[PDB]
Ligand binder design. Sequence first.
Ligand SMILES: CCCCCCCCCCCCCCCCCC(=O)OC[C@H](COP(=O)([O-])OCC[N+](C)(C)C)OC(=O)CCCCCCCCCCCCCCCCC
Ligand SMILES: NC(=O)C1=CN([C@@H]2O[C@H](COP(=O)(O)OP(=O)(O)OC[C@H]3O[C@@H](n4cnc5c(N)ncnc54)[C@H](OP(=O)(O)O)[C@@H]3O)[C@@H](O)[C@H]2O)C=CC1
Ligand code: SF4
Ligand code: SF4
Ligand code: SF4
Ligand SMILES: [Zn+2]
Lengths: 339, 48, 96, 207, 116, 146, 156, 176
Amino acid sequence: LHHAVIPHGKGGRSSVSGIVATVFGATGFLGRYVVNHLGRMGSQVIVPHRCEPYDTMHLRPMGDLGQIIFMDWNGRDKDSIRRAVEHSSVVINLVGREWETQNFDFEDVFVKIPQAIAQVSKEAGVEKFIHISHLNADIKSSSKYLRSKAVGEKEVRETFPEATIIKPAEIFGREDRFLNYFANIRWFGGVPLISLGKKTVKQPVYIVDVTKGIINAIKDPDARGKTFAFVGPSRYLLFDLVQYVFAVAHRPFLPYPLPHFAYRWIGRLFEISPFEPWTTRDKVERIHTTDKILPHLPGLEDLGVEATPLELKAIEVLRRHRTYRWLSDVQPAKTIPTS
Amino acid sequence: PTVKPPTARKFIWTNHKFNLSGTPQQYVPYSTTRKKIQEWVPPSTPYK
Amino acid sequence: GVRTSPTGEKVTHTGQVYDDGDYRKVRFVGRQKEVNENFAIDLIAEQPVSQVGSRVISCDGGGGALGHPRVYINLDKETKTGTCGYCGLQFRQQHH
Amino acid sequence: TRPTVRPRNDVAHKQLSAFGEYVAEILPKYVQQVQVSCFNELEICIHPDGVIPVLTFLRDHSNAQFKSLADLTAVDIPTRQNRFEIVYNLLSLRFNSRIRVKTYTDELTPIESSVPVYKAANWYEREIWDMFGVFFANHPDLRRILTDYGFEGHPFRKDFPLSGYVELRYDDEVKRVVAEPVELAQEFRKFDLNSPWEAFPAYRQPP
Amino acid sequence: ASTSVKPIFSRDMNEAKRRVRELYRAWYREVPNTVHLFQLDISVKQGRDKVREMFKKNAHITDPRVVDLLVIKGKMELEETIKVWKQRTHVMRFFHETEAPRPKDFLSKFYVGHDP
Amino acid sequence: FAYDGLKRQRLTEPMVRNEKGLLTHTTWEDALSRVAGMLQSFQGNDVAAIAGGLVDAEALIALKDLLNRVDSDTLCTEEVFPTAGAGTDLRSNYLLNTTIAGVEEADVVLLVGTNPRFEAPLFNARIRKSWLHNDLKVALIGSPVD
Amino acid sequence: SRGEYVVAKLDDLINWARRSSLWPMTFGLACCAVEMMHMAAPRYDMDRFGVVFRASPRQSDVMIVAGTLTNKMAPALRKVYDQMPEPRYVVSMGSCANGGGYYHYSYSVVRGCDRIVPVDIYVPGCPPTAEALLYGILQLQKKIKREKRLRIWYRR
Amino acid sequence: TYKYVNLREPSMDMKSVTDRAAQTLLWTELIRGLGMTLSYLFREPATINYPFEKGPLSPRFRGEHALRRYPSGEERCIACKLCEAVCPAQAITIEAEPRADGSRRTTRYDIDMTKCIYCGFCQEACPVDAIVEGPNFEFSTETHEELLYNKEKLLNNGDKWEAEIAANIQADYLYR
Ligand SMILES: CCCCCCCCCCCCCCCCCC(=O)OC[C@H](COP(=O)([O-])OCC[N+](C)(C)C)OC(=O)CCCCCCCCCCCCCCCCC
Ligand SMILES: NC(=O)C1=CN([C@@H]2O[C@H](COP(=O)(O)OP(=O)(O)OC[C@H]3O[C@@H](n4cnc5c(N)ncnc54)[C@H](OP(=O)(O)O)[C@@H]3O)[C@@H](O)[C@H]2O)C=CC1
Ligand code: SF4
Ligand code: SF4
Ligand code: SF4
Ligand SMILES: [Zn+2]
């Protein structure tokens, strides 16, 4: 056969793991960690990128010589997609954008592009296909981000029936826009929370846990044609989680409620920025959307991954936001008991 | 070279190429040797 | 000489070429495969056999000290040509 | 005289032999063997207890005045019970001569520090501990000098692998340089160069 | 005659064990300072667990000279940490946070490769 | 000069039969699990084993122990040796008791149905050394080979 | 106009500014630093290309890793790289920094500074001549001249 | 024979004491140091106009590697592996086998230009002048992989620099 590369070595940087992975959207938050884990074990990683080559430099030290290969690709060009997957054995799709641009909207990035990748991958004979969706993907959702997530999730499952679909909650980490989002609001005095952040329940997950789930899903034959839900171990109220972030960051906490219609108005204001908007209408909808419970979907325990509590890994994320070095502790946040 | 031109030979490049690093014509390393151990190919017919 | 396998990839003078389903071909996407188009096995075959009139001849590759160590080539056999072990030049005896 | 052979200095060979006996008589309690090589170098082999006495005698005596410690190092010979061999190279400026003093130790036996005699031995003994693991007793400040902090092992020992056991790398997940077991994209090729024919019959060993 | 060997610091295991406990106390008192000074993300409990694991690795030794060297090396290791000669990377090399768990059982080692 | 056969026709992956009756590559988990299932179902005489001409002692004992734990004793070899009588109970019954180096001490050698020049080339060479130096008398019962 | 024209010219302006004012922070680690000092010497006078002799890390644009990078020094080289404001480039000078060089198989040597930091240009030699290093710097200017930061932003 | 560098007794007559007082107060010897830098401002600088001007080199210069041929086009290398044995950095990797015509030729010839210390021992060891270090020193790359040369790259360098490599060998082989 022309596959089964027969891994060699001891699992290190100069070893061979037999994984030839095309990671789409590898230059972002989640992709930064996926390439690192693939290159740590000695995988051949193809990285199609749309940005400047200068913005992929942080990926080069993640693999041995010749193990990370960079290509140009365009979301709407099938030929470029073909060139980057015709030799791979697994295709990972991490394309996404928390806002809409003048050229790409949520329909483009969460439906058309994932469907194009899935269709081309099927034609090229790619055995495995990992696609990332959201835990709160729903067609009856106020957020157009989460509506397009549901539409695209369904369209991948038909184009590529054997694809593995991962549905994570809000992922927290050093480069995340979830805990870092509830720390830069200090620039605007108090912390506006719809309903004072009492009607929303969040179950955030750790970036490394989500990364080890994807990697274990590649080597696990039972993940083909299976849908997962990566969630953290604890559930929190948006108020008691945002309070914890400020407590860890040692910043003053001045919450105050704001009606839903007014919170969207200010979100409408920040959307004028021709650069990365600080917040948007869709962002406000997702920050306050309660995280769905899907007991009928396998979690991180079925992939051999133990979820990391937000308490352990909050300090590393929020250290940079503190203003003193060697200040001198904070109490764990209140958690909603199960059942 | 005008006064003392170099010796001509058939294998010398007639066209000189400048440094090609960073371009599609860049050099890419690879192993120049063939596969060392051949693997058995099963029969293409049943047995029972 | 230079020939291309049934996938568009040139074959080196050592006979190296990636199979149709080898992932290692991805290194040449957007780039090129370096192959020397001056196969030496073919070029040395273009050299005419030298007709010499003695049983034993010496070859130093031409250039004296700029060549290769001086070897002596026996020419008794009349069924083949005495070839130089270093440079490949062939020699024959004058019909006896 | 042969243009290609190093000329022999027999006058200096006789002087160094005479002084070797001189030292062998004045310090019988420690001197174990004295010898002079064909290129006129004098070696005094001593019991390790005689480091401070012998070195102080050579530094202070009026017919020695070996007031400079040119070098202090160790050799690892695993086939000996006392694998390590401590070598002191001393220079006399009064008599324009050099003497070598050799002792021995093993992994667990310490050797008295010679910092009191020659203050130059401070760093030279930190390097012997760092690279060979010999411990020097009463050293004012003994600790690794050349190797990385927390480095495990003694690189210059004969059984320590050339490439070590760990290699460093930057990992973007933990945002720091990490240490991992060594893997080489190309292994160090080992060459067996020794010829199977004897070269120097003068140094042949009895069977 | 044969077993007569010059000691380093201790003349018997009782004297050696005294130095081991003194070193253990010095390390135990130091972990909170190391965690705060180096801004490590581990907890004091994790750090003190690591110290205990290191000491328990060498609990089968019955040679006073071998124990003295272990204590001598341990004292040097403590000095590099207290005086901040080490950096945050050197302290975090006792935890191996980036090495994937190597298999321990026969079947797991049988699949990956040939190493026993 | 036979080592180059260690580079051709090698088995490099586990293989099992598919739905069409052909052999396809698989993992060590799938192949061993498919073998353990059948081994557990059968027992006693239903499990047998044959050892080839290059098998090592470690593999021979391990296979025998595995087949013993299903109460099987049909551990066979390809090379016949008569079991009638003492059989393979006394080592002296199936060994070269004189040893290879003992031919140099022999003064008469009787070869029965064997061409040692090809079966044991380095044992035949030892016979010639005695034939050449010790004036050894050699007799053969069998086909007249050189 | 077309919009793409304004962005194309603005890229040239900022590309020209960045390659004409390359301020390097030199990590003189071993012999290769000497050949780096001969590029600052009168014959080649790197200062005449806009490349200042030396700059502090907080105002440096490119890091020249000139010499063997040992394990002991590796943490300190990453710390200086992390504190360089962006855009930041790294030039690996000499065999030791390129891939380990003469000391590739040593227990105390980082087999290439690209294990610790990204590298934009590799200058080969042991040491590279002062002119071969100046060719690398000039080859880094052309790399910066090909950047399309704004053209890519305009098409996001 | 020795000499003293700083063994002098300054004169203590009023003439000399007033000279040193004038130097201390009127900064005479500091202004003398300004005259030495003023002179340089009015000299021609030693800078050359690189890349339009290049620094002088000799025929012995050791630069980028190249594999050479005989005038007929046959490769000079006969896979003797002397360069691989002498290479102090172990930067040469060679594999060989009889060629289709029976000649002794290489199938792999790689120089890791990042292990190489550009020492020239390979061209000293070579008995047929196959492996040489050419005069090119301007082959810096944008990636670490472009500096792992294989036989095709080295034969391309030879066919690219033969006109200049042959001339340099002609000007130095009598010293070898
Ligand atoms: C009858 C009329 C009476 C009127 C009054 C008559 C006044 C007589 C003259 C007065 C004495 C002269 C005083 C001169 C100033 C004293 C300086 C001094 O203190 O020296 C001692 C000091 C110290 O000298 P020292 O290091 O040797 O120490 C002296 C004291 N001991 C030894 C005890 C420690 O020297 C310096 O000032 C160092 C000078 C460093 C400057 C380097 C740059 C010099 C470059 C030349 C610049 C030229 C400037 C021109 C500017 C023009 C602008 C328009
Ligand atoms: N981060 C979180 O909290 C959650 C993540 N997810 C999903 O995981 C995936 C990764 O998201 P994340 O990394 O965290 O966020 P990022 O925005 O940081 O990653 C976005 C990546 O996708 C690329 N991208 C966006 N649009 C395009 C486009 N038109 N064409 C090509 N590439 C494009 C980007 O390339 P470039 O930067 O070069 O423009 C970038 O590499 C997304 O699909 C996200 O919806 C789901 C649940 C929670
Ligand atoms: S590459 Fe050569 S010159 Fe540069 S540091 Fe290493 S040995 Fe020295
Ligand atoms: S120049 Fe020296 S180090 Fe480089 S390949 Fe030749 S022998 Fe090896
Ligand atoms: S390049 Fe020269 S020394 Fe090296 S293998 Fe070829 S002929 Fe021998
Ligand atoms: Zn010849």
